[PDB]
Amino acid sequence: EPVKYGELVVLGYRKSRFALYKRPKANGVKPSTVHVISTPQISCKGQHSISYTLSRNQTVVVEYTHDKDTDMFQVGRSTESPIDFVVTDTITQSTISRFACRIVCDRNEPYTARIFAAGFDSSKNIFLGEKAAKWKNPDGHMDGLTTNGVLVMHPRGSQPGVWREISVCGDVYTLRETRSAQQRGKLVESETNVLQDGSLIDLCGATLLWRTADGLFHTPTQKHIEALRQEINAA
């Protein structure tokens, strides 16, 4: 009983193309207890945690727990243990993040893949410092954007679609004024962070092509070569 979620492919113009398979024992996490605390002078939890540091005092700490029905896959430029696919730039300095983003996959059918901005570090942490876009929504919960952000788009199946920012909790947002301003975009309550076949993900410095399991199983990505170049003409 082997199961492949799908595949990642680095668009040209540390490997080429990373496939994703349902790991034996669930990797996934999902958030729980929240702690809020002020301080004259970053902090977190010896577990999976995300830290939102609002003032020079108050800091929210969302401590993530084991999720039974999901697998996590981390992408970024770090080569430490928690990164599952190392992505280098697609050329000076270095734009991509060490822990760019997570791909969380449902372990039961139809094995949906969803993307989240930021990956946990070699310490189980995401840190969101003052100098980075954050907020609480009416839902009650905290959320933020990564400094550069993860941008996702999906084309019409004809193709070139619209680019969007992914928060650190899913939630789709319209682009910032300019790529990475502290001023975040606007919510899109009606779009999700689901990766449908042939979605594009810009990690800021590299682009990746998501491919659904059934996706590849019907069309080879070779036929989609021209469109991807016509569509990468969105930038």
Curated annotation (Swiss-Prot):
Residues 1-157 form the FHA domain. GO terms for biological process: positive regulation of canonical NF-kappaB signal transduction; positive regulation of MAPK cascade; positive regulation of protein phosphorylation; protein polyubiquitination; regulation of Toll signaling pathway. It comes from the Eukaryota. Disulfide bonds: none annotated. GO terms for cellular component: cytosol. The keyword Phosphoprotein applies. Its EC number is 2.3.2.27. Pathway: Protein modification; protein ubiquitination. Phosphorylated by IRAK1 and IRAK4 enhancing its E3 ligase activity. One of its GO terms (molecular function) is ubiquitin protein ligase activity. It catalyses: S-ubiquitinyl-[E2 ubiquitin-conjugating enzyme]-L-cysteine + [acceptor protein]-L-lysine = [E2 ubiquitin-conjugating enzyme]-L-cysteine + N(6)-ubiquitinyl-[acceptor protein]-L-lysine. Keywords: Phosphoprotein, Transferase, Ubl conjugation pathway. The keyword Phosphoprotein applies. The atypical FHA domain contains a 'wing' insert and mediates binding to threonine-phosphorylated IRAK1. Interacts with TRAF6, IRAK1, IRAK4 and MAP3K7. Interacts with BCL10; this interaction is impaired by SOCS3. E3 ubiquitin ligase catalyzing the covalent attachment of ubiquitin moieties onto substrate proteins. Involved in the TLR and IL-1 signaling pathways via interaction with the complex containing IRAK kinases and TRAF6. Mediates IL1B-induced IRAK1 'Lys-63'-linked polyubiquitination and possibly 'Lys-48'-linked ubiquitination. May be important for LPS- and IL1B-induced MAP3K7-dependent, but not MAP3K3-dependent, NF-kappa-B activation. Can activate the MAP (mitogen activated protein) kinase pathway leading to activation of ELK1. Belongs to the pellino family. This is E3 ubiquitin-protein ligase pellino homolog 2. The chain holds residues 15 to 280 of 420 of the full protein.
